[PDB]
C-alpha cells in the first residue's frame, strides 16, 4: 500500500483532552483523528467505505527541527547494573527520535542519554487559559469561571502521522485533511483552539524505516484485537491498556449528547511477538447511527 | 505476638544490636530481632515442609550442614506494587476534591496495609516478615515452601480479580518473588543487590503484561453506557447515585480515630471487607460485634505510620473547608502552594549507597525503617504550626498543599531537617508551584510534577520555584533570594506607607528588559525611590550581575505576593 | 457540498485593550498572552462571546444566535458556524513597535474615590497599546446555503455593534475599543461564492 | 557605559566643608539642565512625530539652536559648562548633525538620558 | 432593535489640564507628576475613565447621595441605569460608554505652528503655616489651547427612558463644564468645555435628532 507522512503545523493554541476540559495533551491517538476524519467525510458528503475498510493511520507524534519522534517501545531494557534510577529515567522518557530508534531497540543507550533524548524534544508548552460564562448574569446570576487547557507548539515543531492505504484512499485522505485544516482538531475548535495547516507528502526515510524487518512488532496506533487474534497476540507481549472514553459529538445521534461505551486499547509503542490487525470497534449503544472507534494496527518491525 | 512486636518496636528501636564497639552499630536491636524472627519463621516453615526429624542433624551436627543450609535456596523475596495510586489520588475534579484528596490517599494506604495483612495471614506469619512498606510498595521475606508459592499465586489471582471488579484498571497490584539463598541475605557472595534488582525486574515485567485474555475481553465487552457519571473521577460503569457521586466516591466523602476493616463500613476493601473510620470505643464495639476485624491505629490494633498533618482539621472553623481555609488571608495574595518533593537516587542509595561489604538484609531493613519513620512521624513534627496539609509521604513521593509562603518556608525547613537526619549522603529535589483557588487539582499536581522533574535535572539538589525559569539551589534560595535580598527590601518598603506595590512592578518591568538604557532607567528609578544609598547600590549591582538579577527578580516577586490587597 | 468561508483581517485597537487572565512575572491585572512568544492575543472566546451578546441584544434563545454560534440544548444540538480563532499580535505592528522602542503593552493607573471617605483607591491594569494590530481569522461553516446571506447580515450587524462597542475589559470606561479591517473574504473549502459577501 | 564612566569620574564629595554632600560636575543639578533637557524633549517629540529615517530641516535648525543653547548655558553656569565639556554633549550634537538620521538622534537622546539618570543616581 | 447613539465632539481645555499617570519620557524631569500620555503618539490624553468618574460623581451629587453610602451601587436608580451597576443580583449594564479623549489633530497642528509644546511645566509652591518657607513644586499640564476628540456611546436599552437619560447626561455635562476635569481643579487646573460636533444614532432605527446634551 501507499504510505504518506502528514505534518501538522498548528497556527493557534490546541486543546487536546484526556478526561477533563482543563487537561491539555500534546498528542492525540489514532481514534481521535479517525473520528475527525469520519466527521469531515460526512460533512463533505463523502463515502466512508475507504476509511472504514482500508485506511490505516497511526497516532500523532511530535516532530521538530531535523527530528521525527516515535513512541518509546515497551521492551525489556537491561539498564545499568549499578543504579536502578536509570529505569526511572527510562520510564520518564516518552519519545525516541527516528534516528535513535534502532539504537534504543538494541539497547546502547545510557540513562543519562535517555534523559538527554527526553529533553531533546522541542514540542511546545502547555498552559491553562481561564475563561468565563456570562450567560447567567443577564437573568439574575453570577459569572461562572472555567478553565481550558491548551498547547502551543514551538515555531518549527508540530505533530505528524503516517497513513497507509490505496491511491483512492490516499486521495480521499488528502481532501479530508484539506477540509480538516479549517475544521480543526481538538476540544474547543469552535472557540479558536486547534486551527492547523497540514502537509501531505511521501517520506523516503519513514518508508525505509517501515520496510525494515525485525523479530518483534511495535504498535504505532492505539489498537485492539478481536478474540481470535487476542488469544495469540498476548503471548509474550508487553503492552499498556488505555481507557478510551468520550461523549458522542453529532447532531443526529440523540436529542441530548450521551457517552460512548468505554473501550480499552493497546497504547502505541507496545511490543508483540505476534502481529494482529485491529477492527473498527463500534462503541455506540441504542443510537441513531453507529459511533466508530478506531483500533486498527499500524506495525513497525524491530530488532531487540 | 503482634502486640509484642509493636512493643519491641516502641522500646528497642534505639538500642544497638551489637554491643561491641569495634563492630559497627548501624543495626539496632529491634531491627536485628525482627529480622531474626522473620528468618526463623521462614526456616521453620521450610523444615516443616521438609519434615526434618532432627534439627541439629539437619544443620548443626557436622557443621558442614550449616554452610550447606546457607547455600540452599531457603527463602523468597517478595514485592507487591500498586499501580495507579497517584492517578487515583489526584485525577479528581470538583469542589469536593479539595477535601477528598487526603481521604483518597489514606484509603489507598490502608488498602495496601490490608492487602499485606491478608497475605501474611494466609502464610501464617507476623508483620516481622514485612521488610518494608511505603508508597504503594511492600517488600516481604517468606519461606520457600511450596505452600508459600501456592499462597502467593492464589493471593495474586484474588487481588487481580478484586481490583478488576471494583476499580477496573484504575488501580492494580502486581506481586513478584525471587528464590533467595541464605548467603544472599548474608551477602557473602555479594549477591544481595543482585537479588533485589532481579525481583524488581520481575515485578516490572509483571507490570508490563498486567492483564490476561479473559480480562481484556471482559473490559471491551460492555452492555450499556452509563448515561450518568460522577462529578470526580467520572466513571459511567458503576451505578451513579444521586448528587452524581459514585459508590466509592461517596464513601471517600463519608470518610472525610482508628480505621476499622470490618464486614460493614464505608469504602470497599479486598477479601470482601469495608474500611470505616471509627471512634476508639466504637472500634472496640465493632471488634466485639464482628469477629476477625482488623483495626489500625494512626501513628488488637496494628500501629500504622502515616503523616496525617492537616491544619484545617485543627480548628473547627477550618474543619468545614479543607484548603479554602488556607487560601483566605488578610494580607498577601490568596494562592496555594503545592510541593512535590522526591529523594533522588533512592534506588541507588539502597543498591549502591551501601558498600558491598556492608550489604545485608538487616542493614536494608534498618535503612527502610529509618526512611519510613522520618517521612511518617518526623514530617508532622516538622510541619507543626503551618497551614499545610500533607496528602502523600514516604520520600519517593511527597505532596504538601497549603499557603504558598508557608509551603516554601516549610520546604526550606524540610530540607534542613532532611540534611540533619540523613547527615548528608541524601539530597532531595523539590518542585513548588503557586496556584489560585479553584484551580484544577489534576493541573496543580501535574504542573508541580513538571517543576519537580525540572529540579531533578543535572545536580539533583535543586528546587524549582513557581515558573520553570526559577530553578535554584537550596542554599541559593534560603540565603541569597530570601535572607540576603527579600528581607532588606521588605524592611525598606514596609517603612513606606504604600508598601510599594507600584515601585515593585516598575522594578520588574525594567528588569525584564536587557537594554542598557533600561539599566539607566533602573538607576534613575532607584534614585527617585529614596531608599538607603547602600541598599540602592546593592540592588543596582544585583541587577548588573546575571544570576543575581534573577535572584533579585524572585525576591521582588515574593515580596509582591507577600503584600497583595 | 460543505463550504468554509475563510475571513482574514486585522483588529486595530483604538484605545487600550485589556483582556484579563484569572490565572512572565507579577503583573497587576495582566492581559492574556501567548504562552510561547509572550505576545498579547485576543482569545477567540472573547470575540465569539462579544459578538453573540451583541447579536442577542439586537435580535432580542433566538434561532439565529444558536445557528451561528452553536447550541447544545436537548433537541437543539447545532454545531457552531462561526469558528473564531485567536487574534495574534501582527508582525507588521510588531516591527512598528520594535521601532520607536515602544513596548507592546502599557500600564494604566486608575482610582476609585469612595463615596464615603473620598479616599482614592489606586489600581493598575495592563492594556495593549493603541497602535497594536491583531490578525484575526474567522471560519464560517455553510451548513445551509439558503440561510448564509441572512447569517452574514447578522454577522455584519454584530461587527458593526462591536466596532461601536468594546472588546474585553472595562469598556464603559474607554478600554477595548477596536476596528475591524477585513483584508479578504474567501471560500477555502467548497464552492459557495462569497465575492459579494462582505462584512462592514 | 560611557555615561556612568563620566559621571563617576566627575563624581566628587564636599570634603572641604566637613559635611557629607555629593557634588557632580562641580555643583551641577537637574535645575541647571532643565531648560536644555526640555528643549531636547521638544526635539525628541518633533522627531518622533515625523515618519522619516533622516532628520528634517526643522529638526536641523532646532539642533543648531540647541547648540546655541548649550553655549549660552555654558556661559551662564560653570556647572553646565563642566558637564558639557566633560560629557562632550555638544560635540555629539555636531556629530548628529553630520550623520543626519533619526536613529543617530535617538541614540543621542539615549546617551543624554543615561547621563542625567546616572547623575541622579550618584547624587 | 439595539440602538447605539454616538456623541462625538471636542473637549476644549480652558486651563491647564493635569490627569496624572505613570509617565516615562526622555530626560525625565524633576516633576513627580507627569500627565498621562498615549504611548503610541506620546501626546497627552484624557482617559475615558476620568470623564466617566467625574460625570457620575457630579450627577450623583446633584441627584443626591444616600446618607452613609459605602459603594457606588447605592446611588440613585437613574445613576445606576445610566452609568451601570454591579450589585449582586441586580446588575445593570452601563448605557453610557465614554471612550478616551485623544489629543486633537487640530491642536497638534496649531502647536506644531507657533513652535509650542503640547504640555507645560507649571511651577507652584506651598507656603508652610509654621516656618513660612516655600517648597517649590512642579506640575505638568496641557496648555489651554489644546482640544481633545471625545467619543461617547449611549445604549438604548429602554426606549421610554431615553429622554430622561439625556436630560441627566445634559445635567452631568453642564455640571462638568462648571466643574473641573481630573487634576488639581480646585486650584484652577482642569477647566473644560464640551463642543458637541454631532449626536447621531450610529446603530439602530432610533432617532436622536431632537436629543441634545448641551
Task: Tell me the count of B-D CB pairs closer than 8 A.
Answer: 28
Please provide the DSSP assignment of C37-91 as one string: T--BEE-HHHHHHHHHHHHHHHH---HHHHHHH-EEETTEEE--SEEE--EEEPH
Distance between CA B103 and CA B126 in Å, rounded? Answer: 28
Buried b (16+ CB within 10 A) or exposed e, A202-234: ebeebeebbeeeeebbbbbbbbbbeeebbeebb
Residue A259, strand partner residues: A247
What is the CB neighbour count within 10 angstroms for residue B224?
10
| Residues E18/E209, Cβ–Cβ less than 8 Å | no
Residue spans of alpha helices (H) in B209-351: 213-220, 247-255, 280-289, 316-320, 324-327, 346-348
Contact list in A for residue E90 (CB cut-off 8 A) is: 140
Are the beta carbons of D121 and B521 separated by less than 8 Å?
A: no
* Residue matched to cell numbers 535580598: B485
CA distance linking residue A76 with residue A258, whole number of Å? 41
Phi, then psi, of A256 in degrees rounded to 5 = -135, 150
- In Å, what resolution does this model reach? 3.1
Q: Which chains touch C (3 or more CB pairs under 8 A)?
A: A, B, E
Name the DSSP class of B478.
Answer: I
Cβ burial of A120 (10 Å; 0-12, 13-18, 19+) is middle
State how beta strands A95-97 and A67-71 pair: antiparallel
Chain D: residue whose CA lies nearest to B529: D121
Q: How far apart are CA B433 and CA B467, in angstroms?
A: 8
Question: d(Cα A199, Cα A194) in Å, to the nearest integer?
Answer: 16
Quick check: C22 and B560 CB within 8 A?
no
- Name the DSSP class of B128: G
Question: Is residue E18 within 8 Å of residue E141, measured between CB atoms?
Answer: yes
Question: Can you tell me which residue has the cell 529509618?
Answer: B370
Name subunits touching A (3+ CB pairs < 8 A): B, C, E
- C-alpha B170/C-alpha B83 separation (Å) is 8
What are the backbone angles phi and psi of residue B260, rounded to the nearest 5°? -110, 125
Residue C14 has, within 13 A of its CA and on its CB side, a CA count of 22
SS (H, E, C) C4-32: EEEEEEEEEECCCECCECCCCCCCCCCEC
- Verify D-A touch: 3 or more CB pairs within 8 A: no
**CA nearest E167: which of E65, E5, E59?**
E59
Residues 6+ apart with CB under 8 A from A99: A67
Cβ–Cβ contact A252 with E under 8 A: no
Which one of C23, C101, C124 has the shortest CB-CB distance to B505? Answer: C124
H/E stretch holding B381:
helix B379-382
Q: Give C-chain residues touching E72 at CB under 8 angstroms.
A: 115
Sign for the CA dihedral angle at B304, B305, B306, B310 comes to positive
In this structure, chain D runs to a length of: 123
Distance CA E152, CA E214 (A): 14
Report d(CA A105, CA A217) in Å as an integer.
11
- As for chain C, the residues directly before each break of C–N over 2.5 Å are 23, 60
With contact defined as beta carbons under 8 Å apart, do B487 and B555 qualify?
no
**CA dihedral of residues B400, B405, B409, B414 (deg, nearest 10):** 10
Secondary structure element (H or E) that encloses residue B362, with its range = helix B361-373
Q: What is the three-state SS of B196-246?
A: HHHHHHHHHHHHHCCCCHHHHHHHHCCCCCCCCCCCCCCCCCCCCCCCCCC
Closest-CA distance of chain D to residue B526, Å: 7
The span from the CA of E125 to the CA of B115, in Å, is: 83
Backbone φ and ψ for A213, nearest 5 degrees, come out as -115, 130
Q: Please say whether the beta carbons of E205 and E1 come within 8 A.
A: yes
CB proximity under 8 Å: C 19-58 to B: 22-28
- Beta carbons of B276 and B265 less than 8 angstroms apart: yes
Q: Is C137 on the interface with A (CB under 8 A)?
A: yes
**In this structure, is the dihedral angle defined by the CA atoms of residues B375, B377, B382 and B383, taken in order, positive or negative?**
positive
Contacts of B229 in chain A (CB under 8 A): 259
Q: Please state the three-class secondary structure of chain A as a single string.
A: CEEEEEEEEECCCECCCCCCCCCCCCCCCHHHHHHHHHHHHHHCCCCCHHHHHCCEECCCEEEECCEEEEECCCCCCCCCCCCCHHHHHHHHCCEEEHHHHHHHHCCCCCHHHHHHHHHHCCCCEEEEEEEEECHHHHCCCCCEEEEEEEEECCCCCEEEEEEEECHHHHHHHHHHHHHHHHHCCCCCCCCCCCCEEEEEECCHHHHHHHHCCCCEEEECCCECCCHHHHHHHCCCEECCEEEECCECCCCCCCCCCCECCCEEEECCCCEECCCCCCCCEECCCCCCCCCEECCCCCEEEECC
* A239 with B440: Cβ contact below 8 A: no
CA dist B514 and B401 (Å) reads 36
Rounded alpha-carbon distances, angstroms, from residue B234 to A20, B94, B170: 9, 11, 11
Sequence-ordered alpha helix ranges (H) in B129-181: 146-166
Q: Which of E44, E95, E203, E206 to mutate to test the interface with C (most CBs of C within 10 A)?
A: E203
Which cell numbers in the block locate residue E182? 481630573
> Dihedral of CA C14/C19/C25/C28: which sign?
positive
Chosen from B515, B524, B530, B544 to mutate, greatest number of chain D CBs within 10 A: B524
Preferred mutation among E24, E25, E26, E39 to probe B, highest tally of B CBs within 10 A: E24
**Kind and range of the H or E run holding B77:** strand B75-83
CB atoms E28 and B524 under 8 Å = yes
Q: Which three cell numbers stand for residue D90?
A: 555638544
Rounded Cα distance, B253 and B249, in Å: 6
The rounded Cα B332 to chain-centroid distance in angstroms is 30
The β-bridge partners of B174 are: B81
Q: Give the number of C-alpha atoms closer than 13 A to the C-alpha of residue E85, restricted to the C-beta side.
A: 19
* Cβ atoms of residues C96 and C62 within 8 Å: no
Q: Is C8 near chain A, with CB under 8 Å? A: no
Q: Helix (H, G, I), strand (E, B), or coil: what is residue B265?
A: coil
Strand, coil or helix: C3? strand
Q: Supply φ then ψ for residue A252, to 5 degrees.
A: -95, 0
**Whole-angstrom Cα distance, residue A14 to residue A195?**
8
C-alpha–C-alpha distance, residues B80 and B103, integer Å: 22
Identify the burial level of A47 via C-beta atoms within 10 angstroms of its C-beta, where 0-12 means exposed, 13-18 middle and 19 or more buried: exposed
How long a stretch of residues is chain B? 565
CA proximity to B171, closest of B163, B180, B179? B163
Contact yes or no for B400/B413 (Cβ under 8 A): no
Phi-psi region of E115 (alpha: psi -120 to 50; beta: other; left: phi over 0): left
Long-range own/partner contacts, residues A87-91 (CB < 8 A, 24 or more apart):
A87/A111, A87/B204, A87/B347, A88/B347, A89/A114, A89/A115, A89/A118, A90/A114
- What the block records as the C-alpha cell of B400 is 504538601
| CA–CA distance, B78 with A242 (Å, rounded to integer) | 28
Taking an 8 Å cut-off on Cβ atoms, the answer to whether C86 and A13 are in contact is yes
CA A25 – CA A153 distance, rounded (Å): 11
Could you give the CA distance from residue A252 to residue A256 in angstroms, rounded to a whole number? 9
Q: Of E25, E26, E38, which to mutate for an interface test with D (greatest number of D Cβ within 10 Å)?
A: E26
Chain E contact for A140 (CB, 8 A cutoff): yes
If you count them, how many residues does chain C have? 200
Please state, in angstroms and as integers, the Cα–Cα distance from residue D95 to each residue in D1, D41, D111, following that order: 19, 19, 13
b/e sequence E9-45, b meaning 16+ C-beta within 10 Å: bbbbbebbbbbbbbbbbbbbbbeeebbbbbbbbbbbb
Retrieve residue C180's grid coordinates.
475591524
d(CA B366, CA B354): 12
Task: Give the closest residue to C104 by CA, choosing from C181, C24, C196, C8.
Answer: C24
Longest dimension (CA), chain C: 66
Contacts of A157 (CB under 8 A, 6+ apart): A62, A63, A64, A65, A122, A123, A124
End-to-end CA distance of chain A: 26
A125/C22 touch (CB, cutoff 8 Å), yes or no: no
**Grid coordinates representing B153?**
499465586
Amino acid at each position: 500500500l501507499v504510505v504518506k507522512l502528514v505534518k501538522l503545523t498548528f497556527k493557534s493554541p490546541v486543546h487536546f483532552g484526556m478526561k477533563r476540559l482543563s487537561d491539555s495533551n500534546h498528542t492525540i491517538a489514532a481514534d481521535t483523528l479517525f473520528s475527525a476524519l469520519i466527521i469531515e467525510a460526512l460533512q463533505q458528503q463523502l463515502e466512508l467505505s475507504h476509511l472504514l475498510n482500508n485506511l490505516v493511520i497511526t497516532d500523532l507524534f511530535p516532530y521538530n527541527k531535523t527530528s521525527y519522534f516515535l513512541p518509546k517501545p515497551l521492551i525489556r531494557i537491561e539498564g545499568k547494573k549499578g543504579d536502578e534510577s536509570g529505569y526511572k529515567a527510562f520510564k520518564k522518557l516518552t519519545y525516541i527520535p527516528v534516528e535513535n530508534y534502532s539504537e534504543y531497540l538494541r539497547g546502547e543507550i545510557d540513562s543519562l542519554e535517555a534523559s538527554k533524548i527526553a529533553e531533546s524534544l522541542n514540542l511546545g508548552k502547555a498552559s491553562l487559559s481561564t475563561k468565563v460564562s456570562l450567560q447567567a448574569v443577564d437573568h439574575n446570576g453570577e459569572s461562572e469561571p472555567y478553565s481550558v487547557g491548551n498547547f502551543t507548539f514551538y515555531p518549527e515543531s508540530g505533530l505528524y502521522f503516517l497513513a497507509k492505504g490505496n491511491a483512492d484512499t490516499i486521495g480521499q485522505l488528502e481532501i479530508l485533511m484539506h477540509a480538516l485544516q479549517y475544521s480543526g482538531i481538538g476540544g474547543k475548535r469552535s472557540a479558536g483552539y486547534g486551527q492547523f495547516r497540514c502537509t501531505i507528502e511521501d517520506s523516503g526515510k519513514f518508508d525505509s524505516l517501515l520496510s525494515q524487518t525485525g523479530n518483534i512488532a511495535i504498535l504505532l496506533s492505539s489498537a485492539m484485537a478481536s478474540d481470535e487474534e487476542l488469544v495469540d497476540c498476548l503471548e509474550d507481549a508487553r503492552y499498556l491498556l488505555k481507557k478510551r472514553t468520550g461523549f458522542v459529538q453529532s447532531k443526529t445521534y440523540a436529542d441530548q449528547l450521551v457517552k460512548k461505551k468505554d473501550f480499552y486499547a493497546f497504547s502505541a509503542g507496545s511490543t508483540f511477538y505476534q502481529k494482529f490487525n485491529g477492527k473498527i470497534f463500534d462503541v455506540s449503544d441504542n443510537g441513531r447511527h453507529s459511533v466508530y472507534r478506531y483500533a486498527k494496527a499500524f506495525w513497525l518491525e524491530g530488532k531487540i | 505476638f503482634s502486640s509484642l512486636l509493636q512493643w519491641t518496636e516502641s522500646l528497642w528501636s534505639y538500642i544497638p544490636s551489637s554491643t561491641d564497639t569495634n563492630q559497627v552499630m548501624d543495626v539496632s536491636l529491634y531491627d536485628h530481632s525482627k529480622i531474626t524472627c522473620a528468618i526463623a519463621s521462614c526456616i521453620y516453615d521450610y523444615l516443616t515442609e521438609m519434615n526434618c526429624v532432627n534439627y541439629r542433624k539437619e544443620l548443626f551436627s557436622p557443621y558442614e550442614k550449616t554452610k550447606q543450609f546457607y547455600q540452599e535456596d531457603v527463602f523468597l523475596l517478595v514485592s507487591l506494587d500498586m499501580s495507579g495510586i497517584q492517578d487515583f489520588i489526584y485525577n479528581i475534579s470538583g469542589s469536593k476534591a479539595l477535601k477528598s484528596l487526603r481521604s483518597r490517599s489514606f484509603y489507598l494506604e490502608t488498602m495496601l496495609e490490608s492487602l499485606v495483612d491478608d497475605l501474611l495471614s494466609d502464610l501464617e506469619l507476623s508483620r516481622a516478615n514485612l521488610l518494608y512498606t511505603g508508597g504503594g510498595h511492600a517488600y516481604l521475606l517468606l519461606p520457600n515452601t511450596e505452600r508459600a508459592r501456592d499462597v502467593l499465586a492464589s493471593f495474586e489471582g484474588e487481588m487481580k480479580e478484586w481490583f478488576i471488579k471494583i476499580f477496573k484498571t484504575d488501580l492494580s497490584v502486581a506481586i513478584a518473588y525471587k528464590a533467595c539463598t541464605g548467603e544472599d541475605l548474608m551477602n557473602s557472595n555479594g549477591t544481595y543487590s543482585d537479588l533485589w534488582q532481579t525481583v524488581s525486574r520481575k515485578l516490572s515485567d509483571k507490570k508490563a503484561h498486567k492483564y490476561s485474555l479473559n480480562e481484556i475481553k471482559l473490559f471491551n465487552s460492555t452492555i450499556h453506557a452509563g448515561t450518568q457519571e460522577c462529578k470526580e473521577c467520572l466513571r459511567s460503569d458503576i451505578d451513579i447515585s444521586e448528587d452524581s457521586l459514585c459508590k466509592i466516591c461517596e464513601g471517600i466523602i463519608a470518610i472525610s480515630s482508628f480505621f476499622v476493616v470490618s464486614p460493614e463500613g464505608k469504602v470497599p476493601l479486598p477479601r470482601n471487607r469495608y474500611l470505616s473510620v471509627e471512634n476508639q470505643d466504637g472500634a472496640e464495639r465493632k471488634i466485639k460485634m464482628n469477629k476477625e476485624t482488623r483495626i489500625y491505629s494512626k501513628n488488637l490494633v496494628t500501629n500504622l505510620w502515616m503523616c496525617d498533618y492537616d491544619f484545617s482539621t485543627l480548628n473547627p472553623e477550618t474543619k468545614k473547608q479543607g484548603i479554602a481555609s488556607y487560601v483566605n488571608r488578610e494580607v498577601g495574595i490568596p494562592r496555594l502552594g503545592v510541593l512535590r518533593a522526591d529523594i533522588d537516587n533512592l534506588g541507588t542509595t539502597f543498591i549502591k549507597g551501601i558498600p558491598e561489604q556492608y550489604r545485608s538484609i538487616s542493614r536494608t531493613a534498618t535503612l527502610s525503617r529509618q526512611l519510613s519513620m522520618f517521612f511518617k512521624f518526623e514530617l508532622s513534627n516538622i510541619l507543626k504550626g503551618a497551614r499545610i496539609s500533607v496528602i502523600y509521604s514516604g520520600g519517593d513521593d511527597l505532596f504538601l498543599i497549603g499557603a504558598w509562603d508557608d509551603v516554601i518556608s516549610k520546604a526550606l525547613v524540610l530540607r534542613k531537617a532532611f540534611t540533619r537526619f540523613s547527615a548528608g549522603k541524601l539530597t532531595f529535589s523539590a518542585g513548588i508551584g503557586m496556584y489560585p483557588v479553584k484551580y484544577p487539582i489534576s493541573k496543580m499536581a501535574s504542573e508541580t510534577g513538571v517543576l519537580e522533574d525540572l529540579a531533578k535535572r543535572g545536580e539533583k539538589n535543586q528546587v524549582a520555584l513557581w515558573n520553570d525559569s526559577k530553578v535554584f539551589g537550596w542554599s541559593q534560595l534560603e540565603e541569597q533570594i530570601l535572607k540576603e535580598k527579600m528581607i532588606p527590601l521588605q524592611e525598606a518598603l514596609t517603612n513606606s506607607q504604600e508598601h510599594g506595590k507600584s515601585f515593585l512592578y516598575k522594578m520588574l518591568e525594567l528588569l525584564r528588559n536587557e537594554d542598557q538604557i533600561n539599566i539607566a532607567r533602573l538607576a534613575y528609578l532607584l534614585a527617585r525611590s529614596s531608599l538607603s544609598e547602600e541598599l540602592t547600590q546593592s540592588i543596582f549591582a544585583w541587577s548588573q550581575n546575571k544570576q543575581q538579577k534573577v535572584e533579585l527578580i524572585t525576591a521582588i516577586e515574593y515580596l509582591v505576593y507577600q503584600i497583595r490587597e | 457540498m460543505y463550504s468554509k468561508i475563510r475571513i482574514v483581517g486585522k483588529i486595530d485597537v483604538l484605545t487600550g485593550l485589556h483582556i484579563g487572565g484569572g490565572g512572565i512575572g507579577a503583573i497587576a491585572s495582566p492581559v492574556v498572552r501567548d504562552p510561547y512568544s509572550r505576545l498579547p492575543i485576543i482569545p477567540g472566546s472573547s470575540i465569539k462571546g462579544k459578538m453573540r451578546s451583541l447579536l442577542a441584544k439586537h435580535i432580542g434563545d433566538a434561532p439565529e444566535i444558536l445557528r451561528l454560534f452553536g447550541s447544545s440544548q436537548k433537541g437543539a444540538i447545532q454545531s457552531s458556524r462561526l469558528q473564531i480563532s485567536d487574534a495574534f499580535f501582527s508582525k507588521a505592528s510588531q516591527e512598528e513597535f520594535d521601532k520607536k522602542d515602544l513596548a507592546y503593552t502599557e500600564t494604566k493607573f486608575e482610582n476609585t474615590i469612595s463615596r464615603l471617605t473620598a479616599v482614592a483607591n489606586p489600581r493598575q491594569i495592563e492594556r495593549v497599546t493603541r497602535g497594536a494590530s491583531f490578525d484575526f481569522h474567522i471560519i464560517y461553516n455553510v451548513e445551509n446555503i439558503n440561510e448564509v446571506m441572512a447569517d452574514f447580515e447578522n454577522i455584519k450587524t454584530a461587527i458593526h455593534l462591536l466596532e461601536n462597542d468594546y472588546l474585553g475589559g472595562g469598556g464603559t470606561r474607554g478600554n477595548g475599543r477596536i476596528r475591524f479591517v477585513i483584508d479578504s473574504i474567501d471560500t477555502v473549502v467548497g464552492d459557495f461564492d462569497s465575492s459579494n459577501l462582505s462584512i462592514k | 557605559n560611557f555615561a556612568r564612566k563620566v559621571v563617576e569620574e566627575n563624581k566628587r564629595v564636599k570634603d572641604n566643608r566637613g559635611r557629607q554632600e555629593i557634588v557632580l560636575f562641580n555643583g551641577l543639578t537637574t535645575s541647571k539642565l532643565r531648560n536644555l533637557l526640555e528643549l531636547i524633549n521638544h526635539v525628541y517629540t518633533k522627531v518622533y512625530n515625523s515618519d522619516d529615517t533622516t532628520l528634517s530641516e526643522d529638526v536641523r535648525d532646532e539642533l543648531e539652536y540647541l547648540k546655541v543653547k548649550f553655549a549660552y548655558e555654558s556661559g551662564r553656569e560653570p556647572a553646565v559648562r563642566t558637564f558639557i565639556e566633560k560629557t562632550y554633549v555638544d560635540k555629539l550634537v555636531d556629530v548628529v548633525l553630520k550623520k543626519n538620521t533619526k536613529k543617530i538622534f535617538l541614540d543621542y537622546c539615549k546617551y543624554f538620558e543615561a547621563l542625567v539618570a546616572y547623575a541622579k543616581f550618584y547624587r
